[PDB]
Design an enzyme around this catalytic site. Structure first.
Site, PDB file in Angstrom:
ATOM      1  N   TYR A   1       4.958  -2.996   5.396  1.00 26.25           N
ATOM      2  CA  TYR A   1       4.274  -3.605   4.264  1.00 26.25           C
ATOM      3  C   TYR A   1       4.183  -2.608   3.114  1.00 26.25           C
ATOM      4  O   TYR A   1       4.663  -1.479   3.230  1.00 26.25           O
ATOM      5  CB  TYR A   1       2.884  -4.114   4.661  1.00 26.25           C
ATOM      6  CG  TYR A   1       2.201  -3.307   5.744  1.00 26.25           C
ATOM      7  CD1 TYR A   1       1.664  -2.054   5.474  1.00 26.25           C
ATOM      8  CD2 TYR A   1       2.079  -3.807   7.034  1.00 26.25           C
ATOM      9  CE1 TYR A   1       1.034  -1.319   6.461  1.00 26.25           C
ATOM     10  CE2 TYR A   1       1.450  -3.080   8.026  1.00 26.25           C
ATOM     11  CZ  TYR A   1       0.930  -1.836   7.735  1.00 26.25           C
ATOM     12  OH  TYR A   1       0.304  -1.110   8.723  1.00 26.25           O
TER      13      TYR A   1
ATOM     14  N   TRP B   1      -1.887  -5.186  10.355  1.00 24.73           N
ATOM     15  CA  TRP B   1      -2.826  -4.594   9.410  1.00 24.73           C
ATOM     16  C   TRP B   1      -3.357  -5.668   8.460  1.00 24.73           C
ATOM     17  O   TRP B   1      -2.670  -6.048   7.511  1.00 24.73           O
ATOM     18  CB  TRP B   1      -2.161  -3.467   8.611  1.00 24.73           C
ATOM     19  CG  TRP B   1      -3.116  -2.740   7.706  1.00 24.73           C
ATOM     20  CD1 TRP B   1      -3.484  -3.099   6.441  1.00 24.73           C
ATOM     21  CD2 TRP B   1      -3.831  -1.532   8.002  1.00 24.73           C
ATOM     22  NE1 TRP B   1      -4.382  -2.191   5.933  1.00 24.73           N
ATOM     23  CE2 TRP B   1      -4.612  -1.220   6.871  1.00 24.73           C
ATOM     24  CE3 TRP B   1      -3.888  -0.686   9.114  1.00 24.73           C
ATOM     25  CZ2 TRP B   1      -5.436  -0.098   6.819  1.00 24.73           C
ATOM     26  CZ3 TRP B   1      -4.708   0.426   9.061  1.00 24.73           C
ATOM     27  CH2 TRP B   1      -5.471   0.711   7.922  1.00 24.73           C
TER      28      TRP B   1
ATOM     29  N   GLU C   1       0.002  10.322   5.983  1.00 20.11           N
ATOM     30  CA  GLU C   1       0.598   9.635   4.842  1.00 20.11           C
ATOM     31  C   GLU C   1       0.758  10.544   3.623  1.00 20.11           C
ATOM     32  O   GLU C   1      -0.131  10.592   2.774  1.00 20.11           O
ATOM     33  CB  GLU C   1      -0.250   8.425   4.445  1.00 20.11           C
ATOM     34  CG  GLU C   1      -0.395   7.362   5.518  1.00 20.11           C
ATOM     35  CD  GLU C   1      -1.175   6.157   5.027  1.00 20.11           C
ATOM     36  OE1 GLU C   1      -1.459   6.088   3.813  1.00 20.11           O
ATOM     37  OE2 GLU C   1      -1.506   5.280   5.853  1.00 20.11           O
TER      38      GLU C   1
END
Length: 392
Positions: free
Chosen positions: A195, A343, A127
């Site tokens: 998300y 998640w 990430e």
């Protein structure tokens, strides 16, 4: 065979208190087709444990083994170990994928680490890769990992270790760090992080995971929806059946500048106040949202975005409920995607006693129901928040 239900389990969830306390045994063995352990870690360029609690030592069983023990009740279940995440950062990945020596070191550390602990695969959660170097080296990493897995599988005569990755929905992130064709080719499947489309880092209220963008969005913002992101990944070379669409058992929160202006894209002063169990401003677990809705909170269904948000005073929370989740499952099936990712598994109403419907894992259960035809149970009905909660 069929649609996948890929559930993320987070180890730090072990530290939550009261209603927020979660353990691997709280997971129903038949709930998911896959369980991804978040997270592993990197030590001296090699795959390792986040901390000793994950490992089994001195008769004391660790979280790894407790997660993998679910496979004894459900031998169909697959487990993977994820490396990366928010805390992990980017630098370690940059160092790991910069040269062939570092990559090979990591890979040949990773294979026995996974095999010795009964994991069925590896999930890459960088990430995020950014820039040409990262773009090329990420592909090299996935490629060499994949080829090593392929070779090992034939040498030791066991089912091949899976290789997956968690990928972003932001067009700029995708463009900057992801060579989509090669990436998709080298991965078994793709966990689309559908998300964090909006959050406290933004001046106005926005939903955590809108299926479609609200009409109030600018042309640029309109890219920030699950539909647009998924179809973007398809457009860039990812096969539809490899895209496993993310589903949050959490919501993003804001504090309204004015409690009377509570619609989407309304001015906010910052993040919403932290919850009792997740203890993080701008963030709420699904059961915390349920607590809000059963204690004076107002419920609003946005039919443009096909998602709900809850309002309590100046507290605004964009979230996903059984309704929006089911609609998203129908959207998944309509678009021929590979399944649903979650998640997380530890932020659903796992006990079944918080949201009111008396159903353990109402959201993920709804996913499994819509995608795989498994009932949640005989009298298992969704919570109709529009009737249960207050209106605006």
């Amino acid at each position: 065979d069929g649609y996948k239900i890929v559930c993320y389990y987070t180890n730090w969830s072990q530290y939550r208190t009261k209603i927020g306390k979660f353990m691997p045994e709280d997971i129903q063995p038949e709930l998911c087709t896959h369980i991804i352990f978040a997270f592993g870690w990197l030590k001296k360029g090699k795959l390792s444990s986040f901390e000793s609690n994950d490992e089994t030592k001195d008769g004391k069983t660790g979280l790894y083994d407790r997660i993998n023990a679910l496979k004894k009740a459900n031998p169909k279940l697959k487990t993977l170990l994820a490396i990366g995440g928010w805390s992990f950062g980017t630098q370690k990945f940059k160092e790991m994928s910069a040269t062939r020596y570092a990559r090979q070191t990591f890979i040949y550390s990773a294979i026995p680490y996974l095999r010795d602990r009964n994991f069925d695969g590896l999930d890459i959660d960088w990430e995020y890769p950014k820039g040409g170097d990262d773009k090329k080296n990420y592909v090299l990493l996935l490629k060499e990992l994949r080829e090593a897995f392929e070779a090992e599988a034939q040498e030791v005569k066991k089912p091949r270790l899976l290789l997956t990755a968690a990928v972003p929905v932001g067009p700029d992130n995708i463009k900057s760090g992801y060579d989509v064709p090669a990436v998709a080719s080298y991965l078994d499947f793709i966990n689309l992080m559908a998300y964090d489309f909006h959050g406290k880092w933004e001046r106005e209220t926005g939903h955590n995971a809108p299926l479609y963008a609200p009409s109030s969005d600018s042309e640029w913002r309109k890219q920030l929806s699950v539909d647009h992101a998924a179809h973007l990944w398809v457009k860039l070379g990812a096969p539809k059946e490899k895209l496993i669409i993310g589903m949050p058992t959490y919501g993003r929160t804001f504090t309204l500048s004015n409690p009377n202006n509570f619609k989407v894209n309304s001015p906010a002063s910052g993040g919403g106040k932290a919850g009792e169990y997740t203890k993080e401003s701008g963030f709420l677990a699904y059961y915390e949202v349920c607590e809000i809705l059963r204690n004076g909170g107002a419920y609003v269904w946005d039919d443009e975005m096909k998602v709900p948000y809850a309002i309590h005073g100046d507290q605004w929370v964009g979230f996903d409920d059984e309704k929006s989740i089911r609609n998203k499952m129908r959207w998944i099936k309509d678009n021929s995607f590979g399944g649903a990712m979650v998640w997380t598994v530890d932020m659903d109403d796992f006990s079944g006693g918080v949201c009111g419907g008396n159903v353990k894992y109402p959201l993920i259960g709804a996913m499994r129901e819509e995608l795989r035809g498994i009932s949640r149970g005989k009298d298992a009905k969704d919570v109709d928040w529009a009737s249960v909660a207050a209106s605006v």
